[PDB]
From a paper:
Broadly neutralizing antibodies are proposed as therapeutic and prophylactic agents against HIV‐1, but their potency and breadth are less than optimal. This study describes the immunization of a llama with the prefusion‐stabilized HIV‐1 envelope (Env) trimer, BG505 DS‐SOSIP, and the identification and improvement of potent neutralizing nanobodies recognizing the CD4‐binding site (CD4bs) of vulnerability. We have previously designed an HIV‐1 Env trimer BG505 DS‐SOSIP, a highly desirable antigen that is conformationally fixed in a prefusion‐closed state, in which neutralizing epitopes are almost exclusively exposed and non‐neutralizing or poorly neutralizing epitopes are hidden, even in the presence of CD4. HIV‐1 broadly neutralizing antibodies (bNAbs) target vulnerable epitopes on the envelope (Env) trimer, such as the CD4‐binding site (CD4bs), V2‐apex, V3‐glycan, and fusion peptide (FP). Cryo‐EM structures of these nanobodies in complex with Env trimer revealed the two nanobodies to neutralize HIV‐1 by mimicking the recognition of the CD4 receptor.
Author numbering:
A (entry chain D), E (entry chain F): 519 to 547, 568 to 664
B (entry chain A): 31 to 141, 150 to 186, 188 to 309, 312 to 321, 321A, 322 to 398, 411 to 505
C (entry chain J): 1 to 52, 55 to 82, 82A, 82B, 82C, 83 to 100, 100A, 100B, ...
D (entry chain B): 518 to 547, 568 to 664
F (entry chain C): 80 to 127
G (entry chain E): 272 to 309, 312 to 321
H (entry chain E): 128 to 141, 150 to 183
The structure:
């Protein structure tokens, strides 16, 4: 539906509809409640900036919906695509990759480095 | 091919010298069964379970230890911690009453004649009006004779007001690692020939510095970090009299230090809630605290130091030692922090020897003082509460802060005398092989690229 | 800056008092302390007084001699009394370590010229 | 491989420009003393990274590591061969070599990117 | 050159010439001037980050000039093209549309989402 | 007018005896009272 | 001449000058300050 | 309390009263003894 974090129960395919909605509320904006608030603000900015840097390390630069190499290894999941995109909710899906994310976050990095090196070599040889 | 055009590289390994602020990194120990600490590590971030050090090659980074800012930052940080820890407990101003003190002779020994004093005084009870006659034992160093049974007065009580050292907290040194924030790198020199000002072609980057104990000592550094191979000599001028010589040992020297008297602490009420801890009723004999080193170890250590020191002063030069010739009670004497009791020892049994071109123990007497003025800014005294039982301390005493004598034109009569002064050389011997570099990731370079439109 | 300028030298009868003084500037007299020399013919160098910073104590080698300061004025007063025949020398005021390190024996830097006391 | 922060800080630029991600990834690591004191350092680190990222984004850049650009080298800041530069010098030596002529280079990159945007607008509007 | 905010009164077309210089100093930089100065720094960081997120999830991230969809609805301004760019100033333009520039920030979002839909579908089909 | 997005199809494992708000608020109220008791009278002389 | 409401009887009229008016004044008296002891450590300077 | 009295040394008719030659007891450095200190207080800082 509508509203911030308003589609966590919807299907995987249908929940990839309000990515902007969830991305917008990541940056909402001496004495007690006067240093806690500032600490929380700094922590939120740092978390968002680290996440954006991690996204930009791989070549996306456009945030919502990214295409990339490092093909889906069958060990990570063994099931049909339409089953993944038609019935699961995102929270259920995150359970399956609770421990497989670390290898992916480096596989995408090395794929991006390879692509950048090929681009540089192609431009240099011309 | 001519189109050699500028391209830009980000995240490039390039650093420039700069200055920043670092923070804690202390071993957790689960930090549950702990009685707090004067350098409160509950607010300090935990250290890495396995810090990683990256060796760099092809690199000759200039190093310098005398205009390093890490030492000044360390000093400011520890002073601030000391001031912060003394606020939230007893603030005993009502102790400048006219003390009436006599001697103590409950089977005393002649060496400690006088010294301890039986003081008695009026003191306010919990009620604001009623008064009680209480008694305590005060060392000779903490009382002066006004109205010259005599009338004594606390030494600090015309010039400052003492906040009693907080009974729950402890001064036990624990290692703390200073870790630079993101974007800054800590460079550490691994060269064994390192001496201070000069490039070190073995520099390695570290996550942050090793465990260092913020100990407080004068003219004899305790629990320092030894330099391998041989005893090293560092200065800012080996040819200037007014500059210390931070001698660093390679073989640790064992030093024991005791206090063979019980101390029955007896808390007494001086106001609403406030309780002041005092000595009284020493059980058994009373003997002055002492320190033991080994003559066999010390003689060899001084011989090694002399052999390494004759390099900078010629191989045909006499080398004599002497004790401190004068100054405060914190420079002419050792300045321990042993289990909450601040010793002040007679370091004149060691520095008494002469060296020419060609089992046993040494006992240093010590004078316990309770009313101290560490972090010598005036008006910040503190009363260390008495500690019950007999205490013992063991240390490696790996350091020396000798100052040269000089001044008699050109001759071979060189004498060295220990002396401290500014409280910065106890850390300048620990942060000498460290520097902070600000990483500059932006960097341009020419290639044959054309930047397709 | 740092150099020291001394004043008050002269002739004194046995059994009197003096008011030796010395002043200095040089944007660096907050890290150093100021003490005094004593050099008699035929003998080496001794010390007479050292006003230690960080403790405010007026250490001296004899009871008679006393060092003193006044406010933020950058002048130091050496008061000497009950003088006797040996106290005829060249008195110089110099700068010692921040906490009056080893004196009566050291030879410091940033020293003065020295008056004459007979 | 030769991982670790500033792992290839001494190696030549040819092999150094392979693991710039290692040097760029940990730029965002992570009332009493060790309180606001750490937070000030955190804010400073965020400030520095944001400055670098905005400086990259202002020019026609921010793909990530490498970014080819217009405005040819003036050939006066370094009269050195390309092969020697890229295989015989370490990065810090290059920094101290061309540290005097940086602001003009940055201004040139900014102007080049703006002119490129204007050219793109002109070539997109007419059709 | 005309310094920061120098072209504020210049005409719209000439004002859209020095965007970089005015987009270059958006991040310049206990007791008094302690926590409060750090508060100012954090506020500046948060404002810049929010502006960049808006120039992001909209679909852009190249900053400065940015082509985009959502054709100009006539209701917002029924005027000629040249008159906007030759004899108007950016402040006057901002006064002209102040309540309209809140639905636009959603039309751009929906256009970006549909463009990403089209790109993803056409890429996955082949 | 605070927003309340009702979510359907979602189940979550709550916990009332391990909550963090119930402890952070507990410390926070004490901090509030300690701050509000500082800037006025601190009567000691009532021990007569 | 500046005022929030120049036609009001309770608003200040901040006159700002074109040429400064030089004004001197002194306290033609030595004031010897003597320090006395409030108590332990604290001191209080009073004109003597 | 101030056992103050009114100053009449080399005074001028215009500055009549004004300065007052106050004498009061005061705790010494030891918090057991009373001094007898004196000071000068203008007539604007003392009330009867
Ligand atoms: C230099 O390092 C040595 C080694 O840590 C320090 O000696 C240590 O002193 C403390 C204080 O007394 C000892 O802790 C005490 O231990 C006893 C017996 O276990 C215990 O009953 C007390 O409650 C307290 O925990 C500590 O054991 C001792 N270290 C060793 C290895 O015995 C020394 O103090 C340091 N130098 C300075 C100047 O602080
Ligand atoms: C620090 O240690 C030195 C180590 O010598 C102490 O020096 C000695 O202090 C005594 C104090 O009485 C001096 O007097 C001597 O006393 C014996 C006692 O019978 C007497 O027989 C001697 O003739 C002499 O008068 C002694 O000369 C002095 N030096 C030596 C070599 O013993 C020093 O006092 C200690 N404390 C300080 C603050 O320096
Ligand atoms: C504690 O307070 C009492 C108050 O009674 C002090 O007693 C005085 O003692 C001196 C000699 O010791 C006598 O001359 C006085 O007459 C006593 N005061 C009286 C009887 O009122 C006692 O000295 C105080 N203890 C100290 C100062 O150590
Ligand atoms: C190290 O010490 C030397 C001498 O101890 C310093 O050089 C002296 O500088 C003073 C400055 O007026 C001169 O009067 C002396 O003549 C110099 N000494 C000699 C031997 O020429 C020097 O500045 C100190 N610092 C360094 C880095 O060497
Ligand atoms: C120190 O002074 C106290 C106080 O006078 C002494 O304690 C007294 O001891 C005598 C016997 O020796 C008793 O009659 C008194 O009643 C004690 N007074 C108090 C207040 O306890 C003590 O003996 C002295 N010596 C030492 C080593 O503490
Ligand atoms: C250093 O050692 C000398 C002697 O080796 C000490 O000089 C003695 O000091 C005591 C007390 O100060 C005097 O009673 C003796 O008369 C002195 N004798 C000589 C020969 O000078 C000196 O005090 C020691 N200094 C320190 C700081 O320990
Ligand atoms: C300071 O304290 C002394 C303590 O005696 C006060 O002297 C008494 O003053 C009262 C009046 O205030 C007289 O009735 C007494 O006869 C005085 N006693 C003595 C022994 O002189 C004095 O008044 C206090 N104040 C000042 C300013 O001195
Ligand atoms: C929950 O699932 C049902 C089908 O099982 C679906 O019709 C419904 O839309 C889902 N809930 C939401 C909020 O999408
Ligand atoms: C008592 O102590 C004093 C210290 O001020 C000392 O001079 C005196 O000799 C001592 N008396 C005895 C009997 O030891
Ligand atoms: C007061 O303290 C000073 C330290 O500044 C000391 O010199 C003096 O002996 C003490 N006692 C006095 C002045 O009666
Ligand atoms: C440290 O060693 C270098 C080596 O050349 C030397 O130049 C420098 O003077 C030394 N510094 C000292 C001995 O203080
Ligand atoms: C200190 O007191 C305890 C308790 O009586 C006793 O066991 C111990 O022996 C005493 N200390 C010494 C050094 O005897
Ligand atoms: C120090 O040495 C003396 C020498 O006799 C000895 O009596 C004492 O017990 C020693 N203290 C130690 C080893 O702690
Ligand atoms: C110091 O004490 C320890 C433990 O009692 C002992 O092993 C060592 O030999 C002592 N050192 C000396 C120099 O006596
Ligand atoms: C020990 O110290 C003495 C002190 O002068 C010295 O003469 C001697 O050479 C040293 N070494 C030995 C083995 O005695
Ligand atoms: C100091 O050394 C001299 C000679 O080296 C010797 O005669 C004297 O006994 C020694 N004194 C001490 C306290 O070691
Ligand atoms: C002291 O020296 C010993 C000798 O090996 C060493 O094990 C110890 O870690 C050093 N430090 C302390 C505090 O004991
Ligand atoms: C250090 O420089 C030499 C010079 O040829 C080079 O061969 C070597 O690989 C370098 N060390 C590195 C890059 O670790
Ligand atoms: C740039 O650095 C300094 C700055 O004035 C200058 O003297 C130097 O000549 C310049 N660098 C080169 C390589 O000329
Ligand atoms: C201001 O407007 C005038 C015409 O009204 C124009 O000539 C001038 O260029 C404008 N100012 C700027 C800075 O362009
Ligand atoms: C300032 O000038 C304006 C010009 O119209 C006028 O309306 C206003 O009242 C003036 N304010 C004063 C005089 O305070
Ligand atoms: C200014 O003063 C006039 C005087 O009557 C009053 O009518 C008017 O409301 C005032 N306006 C303001 C803005 O204060
Ligand atoms: C004030 O007294 C000082 C000396 O105490 C003297 O130099 C000065 O002349 C006096 N003031 C005047 C105005 O004379
Ligand atoms: C001092 O003189 C003034 C002058 O009238 C007088 O009013 C005042 O009361 C006098 N002070 C006292 C204490 O009498």
């Amino acid at each position: 539906f509508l509203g911030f974090l308003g589609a966590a129960g919807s299907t995987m395919g249908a929940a990839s509809m309000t990515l902007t909605v969830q991305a917008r509320n990541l940056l909402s904006g001496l004495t007690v409640w006067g240093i806690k608030q500032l600490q929380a603000r700094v922590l939120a900015v740092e978390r968002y900036l680290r996440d954006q840097q991690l996204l930009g390390i791989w070549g996306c630069s456009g945030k919502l919906i990214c295409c990339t190499n490092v093909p889906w290894n069958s060990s990570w999941s063994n099931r049909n695509l339409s089953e993944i995109w038609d019935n699961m909710t995102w929270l259920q899906w995150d359970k399956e990759i609770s421990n497989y994310t670390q290898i992916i976050y480096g596989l995408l990095e090395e794929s991006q480095n390879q692509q950048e090196k090929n681009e540089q070599d192609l431009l240099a040889l011309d | 091919a001519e189109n050699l055009w500028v391209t830009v590289y980000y995240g490039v390994p390039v650093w420039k010298d700069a200055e920043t602020t670092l923070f804690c990194a202390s071993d957790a120990k689960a930090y549950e069964t702990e009685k707090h600490n004067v350098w409160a590590t509950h607010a300090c971030v935990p250290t890495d379970p396995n810090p990683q050090e990256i060796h760099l090659e092809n690199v000759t980074e200039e190093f310098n230890m005398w205009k390093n800012n890490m030492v000044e930052q360390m000093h400011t940080d520890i002073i601030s911690l000391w001031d912060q820890s003394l606020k939230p407990c007893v603030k005993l101003t009502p102790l400048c009453v006219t003390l009436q003190c006599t001697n103590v002779t409950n089977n005393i020994t002649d060496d400690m004649r006088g010294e301890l004093k039986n003081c008695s005084f009026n003191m306010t009870t919990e009620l604001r009006d009623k008064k009680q006659k209480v008694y305590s034992l005060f060392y000779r160093l903490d009382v002066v004779q006004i109205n010259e049974n005599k009338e004594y007065r606390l030494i600090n009580c015309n010039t400052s007001a003492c906040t009693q050292a907080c009974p729950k907290v402890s001064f036990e040194p624990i290692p703390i690692h200073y870790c630079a924030p993101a974007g800054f790198a800590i460079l550490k020199c691994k060269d064994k020939k390192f001496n201070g000002t000069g490039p070190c072609p073995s520099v390695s980057t570290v996550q942050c510095t090793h465990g260092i104990k913020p100990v407080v000592s004068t003219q004899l550094l305790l629990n320092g970090s030894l330099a391998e191979e041989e005893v090293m000599i560092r200065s800012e001028n080996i040819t200037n009299n007014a500059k210390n010589i931070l001698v660093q040992f390679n073989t640790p020297v064992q030093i024991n230090c005791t206090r063979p008297n019980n101390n029955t602490r007896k808390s007494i009420r001086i106001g609403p809630g406030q309780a002041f801890y005092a000595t009284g009723d020493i059980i058994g004999d009373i003997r002055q605290a002492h320190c033991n080193v080994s003559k066999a170890t010390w003689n060899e250590t001084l011989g090694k130091v002399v052999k390494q020191l004759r390099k900078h002063f010629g191989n045909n030069t006499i080398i004599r030692f002497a004790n401190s010739s004068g100054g405060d009670l914190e420079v002419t004497t050792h300045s321990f922090n042993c289990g909450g009791e601040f010793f002040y020892c007679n370091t004149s049994g060691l520095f008494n020897s002469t060296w020419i071109s060609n089992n046993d123990s040494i006992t240093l007497p010590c004078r316990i003082k309770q009313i101290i003025n560490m972090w010598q800014r005036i008006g910040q005294c503190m009363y260390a509460p008495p500690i019950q039982g007999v205490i013992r301390c063991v240390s490696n005493i790996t350091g020396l802060i000798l100052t040269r004598d000089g001044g008699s034109t050109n001759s071979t009569t060189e004498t060295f005398r220990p002396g401290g002064g500014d409280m910065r050389d106890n850390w300048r011997s620990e942060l000498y092989k460290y520097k902070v570099v600000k990483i500059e990731p932006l960097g341009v370079a020419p290639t044959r690229c054309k930047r397709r439109v | 800056q740092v150099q020291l300028q001394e004043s008050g030298g002269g002739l004194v009868q046995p059994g009197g008092s003096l008011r030796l003084s010395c002043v200095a500037s040089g944007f660096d007299l907050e890290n150093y302390s100021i003490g005094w020399f004593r050099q008699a013919p035929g003998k080496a160098r001794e010390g007479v007084a050292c006003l230690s910073k960080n403790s405010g104590i007026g250490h001296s080698v004899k009871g008679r001699f006393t060092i003193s300061r006044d406010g933020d004025s950058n002048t130091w007063f050496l008061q000497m009394g009950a003088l006797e025949a040996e106290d005829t020398a060249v008195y110089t005021c110099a700068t010692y370590n921040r906490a009056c390190a080893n004196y009566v024996t050291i030879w410091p830097e940033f020293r003065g010229q020295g008056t004459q006391v007979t």
